[PDB]
Design a protein around this ligand. Structure first.
Ligand SMILES: C[C@H]1C(=O)[C@@H](O)[C@H](O)C[C@]1(O)C(=O)O
Ligand SMILES: C[C@H]1C(=O)[C@@H](O)[C@H](O)C[C@]1(O)C(=O)O
Ligand SMILES: C[C@H]1C(=O)[C@@H](O)[C@H](O)C[C@]1(O)C(=O)O
Ligand SMILES: C[C@H]1C(=O)[C@@H](O)[C@H](O)C[C@]1(O)C(=O)O
Ligand SMILES: C[C@H]1C(=O)[C@@H](O)[C@H](O)C[C@]1(O)C(=O)O
Ligand SMILES: C[C@H]1C(=O)[C@@H](O)[C@H](O)C[C@]1(O)C(=O)O
Ligand SMILES: C[C@H]1C(=O)[C@@H](O)[C@H](O)C[C@]1(O)C(=O)O
Ligand SMILES: C[C@H]1C(=O)[C@@H](O)[C@H](O)C[C@]1(O)C(=O)O
Ligand SMILES: C[C@H]1C(=O)[C@@H](O)[C@H](O)C[C@]1(O)C(=O)O
Ligand SMILES: C[C@H]1C(=O)[C@@H](O)[C@H](O)C[C@]1(O)C(=O)O
Ligand SMILES: C[C@H]1C(=O)[C@@H](O)[C@H](O)C[C@]1(O)C(=O)O
Ligand SMILES: C[C@H]1C(=O)[C@@H](O)[C@H](O)C[C@]1(O)C(=O)O
Lengths: 140, 140, 140, 140, 140, 140, 140, 140, 140, 140, 140, 140
């Protein structure tokens, strides 16, 4: 019934920031899209974004405590943070990792994630629709 | 309007084969599910499966020639075949790579794909619904 | 009671092909030897050989379905095929990997197998008698 | 007097397929060019192409049995197949490996071949004329 | 006519020690089994065990001097000792390496041996029957 | 119309030096062969050899300035010199890398070149005829 | 006389979070245990916890300025943060690194720490008693 | 006309902290030096420092939005943060990376930066004068 | 009630041997310290030392048979011996690995242990008090 | 008072050579710029360039003997020459390494230098102004 | 005045053992040669050999205690034993490592020694005369 | 009867240059020492030194042609030059590699040589007496 969508560092900047890699849709538009899709799906989407690891960690804890599912695009922390991994590891509800870009078509260091192994599954390279697809999965 | 769904080695065996990793849905059921979802979406799905690399290659060529999109779960060849990669590289329409299992939660060699970099995007670990999500993306 | 002996690529060529590495016994002789040893042991040996991965995969599936044991010398695919590995992984009956040559005394890439980890056990460097020893194990 | 030219996966697609990397000459044209050059050189060229590993293996065996030289462009299998390597290893006549593209100017995985070490020699990046040069070598 | 069976560190402990990996057969039983199989085969088996590298080395020297074959399960020294390798390298008679466990299905460091390359051949994962099979090979 | 053939360190020694790897043809003979082939082809060949990196660099610069093609066998510097690579990178005309020996059949460090990636193409293992083939390519 | 105990990310969650790896003792209990042990030992323990790197860094600076010893369990930052390492490097008083879990029995990336080399020493796998042992060391 | 100087973790501690590696100049002195040099150069320098990644990210965003140049010494995050890299990647104005210490003369992990590749250029090992030199570049 | 303290190679030499790395306390003093601490704790400590792997192995076996806990400082064998690892793996009672020196602040090869993963926990860099702390843990 | 500026292989070619990577300023212009900046700074600049390693080595020796500072752009030898490193290691006066290009934004092999560790500091990617900045540092 | 010559595993076997790699001189002859050379040089040579690590360690300790120089050929333990390294590290007098064979011309694992770094120096590939040369050095 | 002693880059600088690593003996003294030792030994020593690779190569060729033995200290080229290796490979007479310093006790890149494998043997870390010992070997 409730899904948390959690966005990491530089996802606020989405919109203006390198549109050839990430698109012209802004973060607020993205929230709007998600919130609408959720309505259609009978879910409530709680979308949050922070460039702060500790803030992301808190949101994850809360979802762990609530046993609520999470959609997580952690940005660059995907490739770097064990701390994040360890928080997500406490989640009982499903975890879907999302990347807007096809990381596998970019720098070699982006081809590794600490999160993927403890994710339920992972969507990449489908743009912002990856979020929406991730929703729909959880709907089933 | 037309999508090719292409399944590689051991995907016929889907159903009976290690259900804790891959599920109880059989390949024919999977075709049935996909074909239905496509109808709902206004697409026609052409689903094919082969344990033969040369057969997969032929199907890919055909899609390249037709400029039709492809959903591809290549099984083990994902991690091994350059040949496959090179065929898919000729595709003008989108290519979505799908894995039923979360490969990132398994043997370390499964965490690399030759296909991912030339894919449009990639879905893993969402079971057979990954196919259906992949459809819906293409629908937009 | 029934054992499948399965031989991969270039094992037909056994006989004529580099005898200092692999010997002067031909494939038909090998079938003859195995079939005889099986009789002595009260087993029936079904020996097959193909240079085609898809054909090998089919034979493996069949053994999985029949819950029959397999002796497998996959040739070069031992070092390359995940697909093969994944088929063998479905086997409930024992799987013995056999190499005629001592791969550990040759090129460094031959010292890795995708099959060994899911094999019950592995015999190498004992020539064609490795097959016969593998039989006898299964006899117990 | 007789040379086998053997072309692997996706070489049929030569012509239409990424011409900036591989050119506008089609496979049939290539056969035509080779067959003509052979006439000028007093050789007979037998050019074959398959996307099937087992088919390539059979052609190689045949050349081994005939002690005929081979020109081999194995496509992607160059980087992946031990099986192929092992067949070519049986050749008594010379083996020239040919790549149309300069593999050393592309993805890092293309910079390794299993075939090069057992080749007599190797031509890359000279386009389809590499075949013709390979012929002429054998002519001496 | 005479075979040396040589067992390295922690093989005395065989029996009581992790039976899910190594079995319930004790070392004395193993000697008994081997000694019996040898009688059936017309051989005499000399089975020895030590947790001392220098003791193993002495036994190997003796076999080198006697030009007698050796069956060797060196335990953990398989993965660590060059010294052992160098002694075995002096053997003129055959050397069969045996492991009870399928090392290839365990920790990654067990997948390398210093002995395998100078072995005639290697049996692993067939339990204590690997010894008996190794005998029978030598019988031919 | 004009081609530069440029030979690096120890290519003077060609003739006397390890003939099983490099042949009995001497450097002067090689110049003679090339100069003749060029005449037949309507080209003029300027063949030079030096064991001095700075000398090779100067010859390369000159060819860059003249926009003349180069055939380059850099000897051991192929595997070691970035400096050389950087000079060749300035060439507008084609660059063919030639090795007499099949480097891929020798020490593992010879299997890498700094030059190959900026070469037009590369011939190896065809002996001194590799030079002549390289000429003929440039002729087209 | 005064010791700082510093706990990093997800150590608040200690208690509820994967108890098979980390235990049923909560963070407040841990503070209580430490504070008591300190009393027995004549020390004062200042225990702090934050999921914020910058907060941890500030606490470390303060201890550096005060020349007070630190017990530090940095959680996931142990494996990732150079920044943390650099702060701890300023400490004149001793630094004991503590992990509750035996990191060496878990994922391979946990087997490296940036902190260990600049630590005085390190305790792992002794649960929350590791803290108490670390205290007692400092007491001497 | 305006330059942002951005200093990461532990750069406040500059002054007191390991002076043999980093010097006796404090952060405030550094601001003073920079601010003065800027006046001489006709620029305005905005120097900021934070041990918080999210704070650094915000400052970078702001500079991206303002199309203002940045001088960045990210401290330890240089070696660890992709997130930072991704923010800096949005900068249209130049980016100069500065390290006070010669990182190449220290621990091996310091010899890699995620920032260097997207920097315009990089100064290291020139102490705090590196900042001043970086200014002067931007002045041209 | 009974603890085995087991010391490997060169721990007799403790005292005289490089005191800047290991201290001025001799092995006999160490036994004395441990034996006293044990009395205070109500335990009996059996401390043994050998430079012989086979001797250490025997002591470990004995503890396995007795289901007695072990404190083990294996010296250099920590980094080299699988054999030792395999013996310790049979222990049902706890195993604490102790190093006097902070191995993580020394040569890179010391930063790996074969024992750590099968240890209950590990203390390093706390000098000879590490033994005493290890005792006290076992006391609880 | 006197500074040596030392330029390695292919730096003469600066000007004409790939201007998108290195610029349109020629070497003589560069000398002119440096010589002028030195005058302004009260220094005398001795700028030399050679494609010969032995020549560079001689210039370095001379500076070592004179205890004069050096600015060194060694070109490709930066990544390859230990010999150069060893000469520079004899310098008592400061050594500044300069690269015109941002090597960290190019081929992966350019991201390592043998010189950086024994340099005082290093400037890269600031074009030919890097030389001038390097001067000014030495002026202080 | 006194030198210890210490020989490790399989050096007794010297003489009979692979003479193409190690020669026809036996160990007793070697002692005889050394003892004679020592007389000529005014030294006394104490030559010992053991296949036992603990025995070698004891001899090393004794030399450390006596502050006597050591010539050490440790055989295979050179590549494997940290324990040995640690004993030799206690030596105040010089340590010369000797290998009869040129290890650098053999298996790749022989090209590393744990002893070389703490040796004064190392002689390899000069046969048994390496011992004699090592003596003479110590004589000065 | 005649030996060539060949010294590479920076060996002229021997004497003045880092004496803690290389000593206070100058190159001329070294020639003097060698020339004297040769007289005592009945040999004639031809000692040459160059910082030029091409010059060293010429001297090596000459020795190959003369079938004269060589003592070679190539300095930094030891670790970098294949070209040198290839020249030395032509030598029929023995080749002794000498390093003054114990390279194995220094930077990790010094622990590899291209020359060692084709050397007869190698002396390191015995200072300039290594030359003299190398002479004496050749004397036998
Ligand atoms: C948001 C994106 C990033 O910030 C990148 O660091 C990451 O590699 C890919 C990313 O997570 C994305 O494609 O959504
Ligand atoms: C079908 C699956 C396989 O066959 C595996 O080889 C592969 O690693 C994962 C897989 O593609 C899947 O999860 O769908
Ligand atoms: C049959 C053999 C091969 O084809 C090789 O590729 C393989 O490395 C070893 C082999 O499986 C064998 O030794 O039987
Ligand atoms: C035919 C080409 C391929 O298919 C690629 O896979 C291969 O890397 C290069 C190739 O063999 C070629 O350049 O001819
Ligand atoms: C006896 C076993 C061991 O001691 C392990 O160290 C080794 O990895 C495997 C072993 O040799 C066996 O499976 O027999
Ligand atoms: C001339 C040859 C050499 O000098 C070797 O160093 C090189 O690896 C191969 C070579 O370039 C050749 O085969 O022509
Ligand atoms: C607190 C734990 C963690 O958060 C993990 O990331 C770390 O690998 C181990 C840990 O520090 C612990 O075992 O206390
Ligand atoms: C400020 C310094 C650091 O904090 C270190 O982590 C870094 O490796 C180097 C540094 O950025 C510096 O030399 O200025
Ligand atoms: C006793 C020490 C050694 O012998 C070293 O080999 C080892 O690396 C560390 C050691 O175990 C210790 O610090 O106690
Ligand atoms: C002069 C340039 C080169 O020659 C390149 O080899 C080197 O990688 C970078 C260079 O030193 C430069 O950017 O100045
Ligand atoms: C005695 C020899 C050996 O035992 C080998 O293990 C070693 O690699 C080389 C050796 O030390 C030697 O060449 O003397
Ligand atoms: C002469 C020395 C050098 O120049 C170093 O480059 C080399 O690593 C060691 C050296 O060859 C020596 O120790 O004689």
């Amino acid at each position: 019934l409730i899904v948390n969508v959690i966005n990491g560092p530089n996802l606020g900047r989405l919109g203006r920031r390198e549109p050839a890699v990430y698109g012209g849709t802004t973060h607020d538009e993205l929230v709007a899209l998600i919130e609408r899709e959720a309505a259609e799906l009978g879910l409530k989407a709680v979308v949050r974004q922070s460039d702060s690891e500790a803030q992301l960690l808190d949101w994850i804890h809360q979802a762990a405590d609530a046993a609520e599912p999470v959609i997580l695009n952690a940005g660059g922390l995907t490739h770097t943070s064990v701390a994040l991994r360890d928080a997500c590891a406490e989640l009982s509800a499903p975890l879907i990792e999302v990347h807007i870009s096809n990381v596998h078509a970019r720098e070699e260091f982006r081809r590794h994630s600490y999160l993927s192994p403890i994710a339920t599954g992972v969507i990449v390279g489908l743009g912002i629709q990856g979020y929406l697809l991730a929703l729909r999965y959880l709907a089933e």
